[PDB]
Design a binder for this molecule. Structure first.
Ligand SMILES: O=C1C[C@@H]2OCC=C3CN4CC[C@]56c7ccccc7N1[C@H]5[C@H]2[C@H]3C[C@H]46
Ligand SMILES: O=C1C[C@@H]2OCC=C3CN4CC[C@]56c7ccccc7N1[C@H]5[C@H]2[C@H]3C[C@H]46
Ligand SMILES: O=C1C[C@@H]2OCC=C3CN4CC[C@]56c7ccccc7N1[C@H]5[C@H]2[C@H]3C[C@H]46
Ligand SMILES: O=C1C[C@@H]2OCC=C3CN4CC[C@]56c7ccccc7N1[C@H]5[C@H]2[C@H]3C[C@H]46
Ligand SMILES: O=C1C[C@@H]2OCC=C3CN4CC[C@]56c7ccccc7N1[C@H]5[C@H]2[C@H]3C[C@H]46
Ligand SMILES: *[C@@H]1O[C@H](CO)[C@@H](O)[C@H](O)[C@H]1NC(C)=O
Ligand SMILES: *[C@@H]1O[C@H](CO)[C@@H](O)[C@H](O)[C@H]1NC(C)=O
Ligand SMILES: *[C@@H]1O[C@H](CO)[C@@H](O)[C@H](O)[C@H]1NC(C)=O
Ligand SMILES: *[C@@H]1O[C@H](CO)[C@@H](O)[C@H](O)[C@H]1NC(C)=O
Ligand SMILES: *[C@@H]1O[C@H](CO)[C@@H](O)[C@H](O)[C@H]1NC(C)=O
Ligand SMILES: *[C@@H]1O[C@H](CO)[C@@H](O)[C@H](O)[C@H]1NC(C)=O
Lengths: 345, 341, 341, 341, 341
């Protein structure tokens, strides 16, 4: 319960914080933007990033903890020569009597303030009417991820800052000249952030008849390390395929030896692929890892099939098939690797 | 000074009351609604629900707020005093949790024109209930329902209407892993009938289709290859007992691990799906592949000796073509009754 | 002016007090309750709870709120001033968490009739707790409990009663991943007794049944098929030692990899279930067949004229291939009739 | 009017101060506490905590709230005016999070007798922490506590005491998926000593036993049968090299499948549990059986004196038929006495 | 009464203002901080954070609150009017979420001594973020950071200092599922420099060590037993092709079963770890054991003086009996000396 002009007599504010703003907040309407019916106001926005992570492919979102700072000019808050100190601090419980821009994030799903011991918001007023507001947030933006080339993929996550109900004719947003987005020394479980965040130009929104709306955009680029999948998933599957070619050098009369070798190589590849179904993300379409696993199964499957060919030709030389398949199965598998790489790189 | 003009519009001196609907004791109120969708996802099979982030816009007319002396048409209202204006009591029927947004300010807006039209825009998140069935899990099409209805007004006071153009819009570049959201949407009327009267309601329908890329390459093609591998035994010489028995029982073990290992990525239900019938029949085919060899092995050396050998040789010759033909007949009937429904 | 009229019956001019029940120092007040279930599900055995979304309606009488001069039959109350009317202090006994709904406005409605009758409808969500017994895990029937009972009012003051007709209603088209909600419900009186006094309650019961269809085709039938592959070794000559040893083994391995890997699907329960007995006995049959070959292989080599020890080896296999299916059928008909009927 | 009488007692003319404790500058305030438990469960070893839903009652005395003119023995107080009455600053020492219940009204009650006796009953949902020891995971006893501290009053101001009868009560019909809650409970004083002073507390202790019916039939019995199958190879002929080698290496594969399949169903710890010792040495027995045949085959292959190596190879199989069961029987004696006595 | 006496010092009569720091336009105020830890845990690598429950105490001197007329000392403030006094602005730079406690009352306390000293104790929970490095996942040490920061005051106005004795205390009896909390803490100054100016910061560091008990007996020892079983094939007879092929293709199948089965228990990390080197190299040893047999098989079979082929075939097995165990001991020496000591 506060008013810009209310009847109350208190002699204790004497050149204090409380004494000076009440003279400033006389006939001051918080619902009227600065320079009403004139030049639109301009905001300088910079973002400091504290925490980054919790990147999820199930819900396509990621959580960021930020520091947000905005600056503008209010000619109605001139500071005269009567007060000696340059800056003033507004008590955080009473922002309802001051004008602030209506900023919001376009791709925001959930956000909250921080009040661990006090409210983490401050506001300064300078001599020339400049207003500085700084605050701490915990947003949950949305990042659409494309997992087609899943083991080696690059994702671009997006951050947007719009105005809810002011057009470009009244409120415009600007990045700071220097250091608009700053980073810290943190680590990520799977991805790897880059210190090349491009501050994309203003993606001003156009709507059906309402008018233009200002927005500013910053893009983060993420790359995925391939160390675990290349040695834990790729290398074991390569070794089983070599063991499928092992039966070409065994004698054809060993029916009880080549058959269990050819059927246990299929079981090893079948067990390896189905064990990773509970570890890889579920996207319900074909990824780059799934093409490798099914093509390796065909090579193990074709090794046992050709033995049935050579086993029936003998009881009807006919060892030229094993001589031909010795220089054919590794020769055709080499072309698949050249095709599989140099496409995904 | 637009702020002091509101006291002349509504207040103690004015007769405006927030508890009385416009056009009292007269015709009902027409409300026009639009919906803009920003996010869509989190299709949960276990809890039978999904999440959505929307923009809601409602328009109506209030004759008590008309004015003619103030020059400009637009007149915005501060969100801190939104309780002084009559608003419709819209709510979502299949709603399981919702909240507003206060990321920096209130994400609400109220605009009053000169004639009396009122524009009201808010931004909310929803967790809507969508019942679904997985009788044919890999080949299924599901429908999502989003209903908007009044809480305490009948036909005589409040009527909801969809917008003439641009009723439901979806933000560009929207994706979700499991499903594909089709562009066609249906706008229907579902008026509720109760023992107290008729309550207005409007609904929008979304059609969802699942992709067959991952299931065909992971659970169908490897299951087909193992069955073909079990037919190799019909070409091996019948005297190789350790080779034919070892091949037959290993294919059964390979099929079991394929079925048991794939249940992690499948949804948890308790009724039979279409993927379960494929795995059960494929297990039945490799079960019978080893069992015919016992008939071959027992008929041989049972005791003129070439008569019994020719009897056992005709079993492998007949089953060499009977097994692939039977599997083809089942394969045709499976895709006809499922992919073409 | 409805707002002006309500201020006369509720203001400081009137002697109405919100902390005094109607019919003070007299007969108790009747309360009639109704339940309309909108959502149902999310039944979890880890926490033993389930989430329900309902519409709750209460009706009683208040002689202090009687009017005759007003022309309107009913008067609606502003939800922001609901604290100035006496209301029953209903709450749920097995409640583990609840919320109100404010999706666009308050989802509450209070209406006062001309004769003093008060109608009160709210929309709330609940997380009720139910104990579950999974002893007969696939063929289990569970019971869910809803209780509505007072907080600090005895029999002399507040009495709860179900509605005469249509007391509990459920919306159509509700499905569950695991259970069937039957259409038959029970309405029973509960009355807690304490040292302080006697307290009113009302109870509503639901019955649930499992599908049981998926467990037959996924883990019962493959377990039945594997033990058939155990018995095929009795029709093979024992001179082929690697054939029968390699078939007796990898059948236990197939049974082991059938029991393993189902741990994720089965609920985490520290006591035995109906499914666990089936899997243990099925492992006992495939294990006991491998010892049968060890008995016949050791006896045959013991001989190495009369040569009657080889005929003794025949008698072990001839008896075993008839006794093994007969003893399995006896257990099978014993298992089903004492766990289903 | 009961409400009018309480206004005089709480009025500024009465001079009542909410911050001043009763019996100021005198004997300390003695409070009696009771606890009724509605639900129990959600025991998790991942975060070392469990959830509970209780009714909490406190009784004390206040000479300022003494009346004799009013005929009614007890006067109720509305929950909205709870800030006008001094209350103890009770809190739980080992809690992680808590909340009140507001399903329809505030679940709080306060009563004032004629002689100044004050009763105060509330309903609280709590999450309490408890360290756990899983060094004997298949069979272990866990103890969970509950502490009731005083935030800012020492022993000369506030003392907490249990009720002499019915201190802790548990509602009938509660069940847990893992543990069994014993009937007996322990009540004791655990008062704290700090540099600022001495602070009161009271405690309640619950003992839980984990039933091991599931672990016996799923992990111990199948592991026992696999080890017995490895001893079959000592009876097979030593000339059957593919038979004995194939049985030996597949038994290790079956044992490894049993161990890895059960890994996902155990709590995630970093120290050695009692189940891990059993699974490790059962792998050691089947591993040692395969090395036994390697010594037999290597000795018999020498010089293919002719019957000298055959007698030595036969003597190894002869003593291994009785050495392996007695060693395993000795270990089972030591395992089931250490973890049971 | 202390209530009316305190209002003289802090009311509208006195010139005290809550928006002015003590000792205005003078030396900076000094704050002494203490931390008492109640519960510790919930360490997760998927979100890289941990959760604590702490007691926080701050001490500073305010000369405007000095009184020399009350007979008693150490006045206590009600938490309702806690915003009428000056308090330092403190926050945690690692905080990802925090809350206060309202379990029964407000868990805050403020005390004002006679000379002007102010004591302020609160109880809060934090979700602090710490980076982690799992490059040596089984045997590794982690350090966690707890930072205390001033929001809008520089060195000219505010200064944070640790307590002289007992700065950080941990309650006894804390256990963790996988980590060991060292008793040696570190207190450091970590003042942050910005373009606006210097800001105060004080930090405390905890050291965590991971236990080796579970991984050594479940994933390290069974891997060592498997590669020993691959060396049995060097002693089997050379002509036993089905025996030696089966021992070596099942061993690879056994090894991949253990490696893939244990991977579910691992944290989800996209780069290499310490055990990933162990599992890959030990897989390479089983792979090389089967590959050398083909070199033995192809050399001996070639051309059915032909005695050199048989002599060269035995020379491979004789060398491999000692070369394979020797090179594995070299790998164990290098692995355990570069990931430890
Ligand atoms: O009339 C509208 C509807 C339209 O909805 C899509 C989202 C938008 C983002 N903000 C939110 C409020 C809105 C707006 C401001 C002032 C008058 C009308 C109005 N809107 C929405 C509009 C856009 C633009 C803007
Ligand atoms: O008497 C009732 C009960 C009935 O409950 C099912 C849900 C309904 C949806 N809204 C919520 C309030 C309600 C209503 C409005 C005015 C008077 C009585 C009344 N209700 C519910 C009713 C329907 C219709 C309506
Ligand atoms: O004195 C008591 C304790 C007892 O606690 C178990 C739970 C109960 C359910 N309600 C909650 C409040 C209570 C009650 C009402 C009026 C005076 C005393 C009082 N209680 C609890 C009581 C029962 C009954 C009732
Ligand atoms: O000065 C202190 C610090 C100390 O912190 C550990 C926790 C404690 C539990 N309660 C919370 C407040 C406290 C207390 C009360 C009155 C004056 C000082 C004061 N404290 C804490 C103290 C103990 C004891 C007590
Ligand atoms: O201008 C700024 C931006 C900068 O943001 C990173 C975080 C910081 C921590 N606190 C929060 C508010 C801040 C501050 C105080 C007074 C004037 C400007 C100002 N800030 C941030 C600043 C640092 C330092 C300080
Ligand atoms: C306050 O400042 C004014 C000038 O701004 C000065 O004249 C006056 O003396 C100061 N002190 C008081 C108590 O007003
Ligand atoms: C913002 O976009 C407008 C056009 O939409 C452009 O005129 C203006 O220069 C932009 N502001 C920038 C890039 O700072
Ligand atoms: C609202 O729409 C209905 C349906 O056409 C119409 O009959 C009614 O007149 C409309 N309301 C008004 C105030 O015109
Ligand atoms: C209902 O009210 C009547 C009269 O007020 C009285 O019988 C009693 O209070 C209630 N009856 C029952 C059965 O609850
Ligand atoms: C307990 O407290 C009451 C309340 O003042 C007091 O009268 C009584 O003597 C106390 N009992 C003791 C200290 O044993
Ligand atoms: C705070 O500590 C510094 C360190 O010496 C000292 O110089 C300063 O005077 C102290 N502040 C006060 C108010 O005494």
């Amino acid at each position: 319960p506060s008013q810009l002009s209310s009847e109350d007599l208190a002699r204790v504010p004497a050149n204090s914080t409380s004494n000076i703003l009440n003279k400033l907040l006389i006939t001051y309407d918080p619902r009227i933007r600065p320079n009403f019916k004139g030049i639109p106001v301009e905001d300088r926005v910079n973002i400091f990033i504290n925490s980054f992570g919790s990147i999820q492919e199930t819900t396509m979102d990621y959580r960021v903890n930020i520091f947000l700072r905005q600056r503008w000019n209010d000619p109605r808050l001139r500071l005269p020569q009567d007060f000696k100190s340059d800056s003033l601090t507004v008590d955080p419980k009473m922002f309802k009597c001051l004008w602030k821009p209506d900023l919001f994030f376009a791709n925001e799903k959930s956000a909250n303030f921080h009040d661990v011991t006090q409210e983490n918001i401050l506001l300064f007023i300078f001599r020339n009417g400049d207003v500085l507001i700084s605050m701490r947030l915990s947003v949950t933006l949305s990042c659409p991820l494309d997992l087609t080339l899943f083991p080696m993929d690059t994702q671009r996550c997006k951050m947007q800052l719009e105005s809810f109900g002011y057009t470009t004719d009244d409120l415009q947003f600007m990045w700071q000249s220097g250091d608009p987005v700053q980073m810290d020394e943190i680590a990520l479980p799977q991805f790897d952030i880059k210190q090349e965040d491009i501050e994309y130009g203003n993606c001003t929104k156009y709507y059906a008849g309402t008018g233009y709306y200002t927005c500013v955009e910053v893009i983060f680029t993420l790359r995925r390390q391939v160390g675990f999948y290349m040695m834990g998933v790729y290398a074991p599957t390569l070794l089983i395929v070599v063991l499928s070619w092992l039966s070409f050098w065994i004698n054809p009369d060993a029916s009880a030896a080549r058959v269990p070798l050819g059927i246990l190589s299929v079981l090893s590849l079948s067990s390896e692929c189905t064990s990773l179904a509970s570890e890889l993300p579920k996207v319900s379409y074909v990824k780059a890892i799934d093409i490798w696993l099914i093509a390796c199964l065909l090579f193990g499957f074709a090794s046992l099939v050709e033995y049935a060919v050579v086993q029936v030709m003998l009881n009807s030389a006919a060892k030229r098939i094993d001589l031909y398949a010795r220089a054919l199965f590794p020769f055709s598998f080499l072309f698949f690797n050249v095709i599989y790489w140099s496409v995904y790189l | 000074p637009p702020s002091e003009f509101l006291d002349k519009l509504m207040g103690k001196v004015s007769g405006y009351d927030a508890r009385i609907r416009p056009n009292f004791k007269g015709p009902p109120v027409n409300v026009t609604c639009n919906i803009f969708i920003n996010s869509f996802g989190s299709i949960a099979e276990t809890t039978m629900d999904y999440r959505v982030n929307i923009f809601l816009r409602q328009q109506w007319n209030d004759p008590r707020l008309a004015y003619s002396e103030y020059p400009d048409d637009s007149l915005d209202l501060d969100p801190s005093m939104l309780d002084s204006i009559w608003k419709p009591d819209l709510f979502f029927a299949n709603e399981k949790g919702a909240n507003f947004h206060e990321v920096t300010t209130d994400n609400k807006l109220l605009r009053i024109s000169k004639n009396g039209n009122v524009l009201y825009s808010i931004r909310i998140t929803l967790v809507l209930a969508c019942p679904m069935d997985l009788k044919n899990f890999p080949m299924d099409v599901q429908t999502c329902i989003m209903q908007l209805e009044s809480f305490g007004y009948t036909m005589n006071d409040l009527i909801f209407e969809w917008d003439e153009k641009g009723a439901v819009q979806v933000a560009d570049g929207l994706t979700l892993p499991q499903f594909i959201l089709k562009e066609e949407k249906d706008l229907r009327y579902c008026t509720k009938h109760y023992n107290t009267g008729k309550f207005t309601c409007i609904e929008a329908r979304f059609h969802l289709e699942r992709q067959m890329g991952y299931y065909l390459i992971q659970m169908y093609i490897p299951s087909l290859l193992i069955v073909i591998l079990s037919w190799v035994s019909f070409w091996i010489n019948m005297d190789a007992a350790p080779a034919r028995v070892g091949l037959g029982i290993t294919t059964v073990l390979t099929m079991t691990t394929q079925s048991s290992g794939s249940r992690a990525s499948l949804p948890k239900v308790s009724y039979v799906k279409a993927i379960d019938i494929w795995m059960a029949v494929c297990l039945l085919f490799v079960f019978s592949a080893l069992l015919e060899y016992a008939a071959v092995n027992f008929i041989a050396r049972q005791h003129m000796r070439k008569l019994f050998i020719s009897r056992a040789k005709r079993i492998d010759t007949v089953s060499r073509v009977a097994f692939p033909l039977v599997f083809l007949i089942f394969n045709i009937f499976y895709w006809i009754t499922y992919k073409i429904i």
